[PDB]
Every structure is written in C-alpha cells, then in structure tokens.
Amino acid sequence: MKIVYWSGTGNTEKMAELIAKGIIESGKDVNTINVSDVNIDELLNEDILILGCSAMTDEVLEESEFEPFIEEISTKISGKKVALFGSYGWGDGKWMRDFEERMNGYGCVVVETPLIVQNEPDEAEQDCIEFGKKIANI
C-alpha cells in the first residue's frame, strides 16, 4: 500500500507514520511517500490511495505541491478507493470537508471518515494506528 502526504512542520508526517504502523501491525506492507517524491504512474496501480495534507492558507490544501498533485491525478482516479487524513490548527475541519467532497466529485470512493487531528498527534496516537488498521481491513 502507499501513503502520500504533505507536511509543513511534521504533524501530518507523524500521522502518516502512525497510520503506516497500523497497516504493518495488521500484517501488510506500506510505503510512506512525501508528495514531492511521488511517482504518479506507480501510485495509480494501488487499489487504495491514502492521502494526507494539513490545512493551509485559509481552509484549503497546500498550494505549491499538494494541490497540483491532486489536480494531476483527478482525471485518472474515478472508481478508486481513497482514505484521507491531515492535521489542522484552529478551524474545525472545513478544508477536509472540502477535500472529501472534491475526491467524491472525481468519482472516488472515500472508504472511511477522514481522520483529522489538531496539531501534533500526541493523545491521538492510537487513533492514527486504528485508522491504519481499518484501511488494512478493506
């Protein structure tokens, strides 16, 4: 499996590692890839795309790297399963509500409720691991 993410200070990156740990504990393998090093053709071979990005600017996806990546794959993911996650700071998840609506609009099947954690996942560590386990069970 593959987890692609963008993280500005490391919060979403930490979530990614924990979600990976959950998948691995379930007995499967998984690679975490920062959005800047992703190979789209390979990524499209996956049955489930696990994507993460923190809330940026004003409730939107990071603009210089993550957003273009989503635009890039938008036309080639109809019918694919996707799981979404990310950290946020002061809002209440508007950027994630929009991200989920967007992926749905592209024809994707959002397999689970998106996982959002405020700031660093300290207390939510197990929640991240459990999300990974849910994904590994699909």
* Residues contributing to the site for ligand FMN (CB under 6 A): 7-12, 54-59, 87-91, 119
Q: Which residue type does 47 have?
A: D
Which is nearer to ligand FMN, 36 or 78 (by Cβ)? 36
* Selection from 95, 73, 68 nearest residue 84 by Cα: 95
Q: State the nearest-atom distance from the C-beta of 70 to ligand FMN, in Å.
A: 16
Which is nearer to ligand FMN, 17 or 26 (by Cβ)? 17
Q: Can you give the C-alpha Rg of the chain in angstroms? A: 13
Which is nearer to ligand FMN, 26 or 91 (by Cβ)? 91
Tell me the C-alpha distance between 52 and 115, whole Å.
9
Q: State the nearest-atom distance from the C-beta of 78 to ligand FMN, in Å.
A: 28
Q: State the nearest-atom distance from the C-beta of 22 to ligand FMN, in Å.
A: 18
Which is nearer to ligand FMN, 91 or 125 (by Cβ)? 91
Q: Give the containing element (helix H, strand E) for 4.
A: strand 2-6
φ/ψ bin of 64: left (φ > 0), alpha (ψ from -120 to 50), beta (otherwise): alpha
Q: State the nearest-atom distance from the C-beta of 123 to ligand FMN, in Å.
A: 14
- 70 touches 62 (CB < 8 A): no
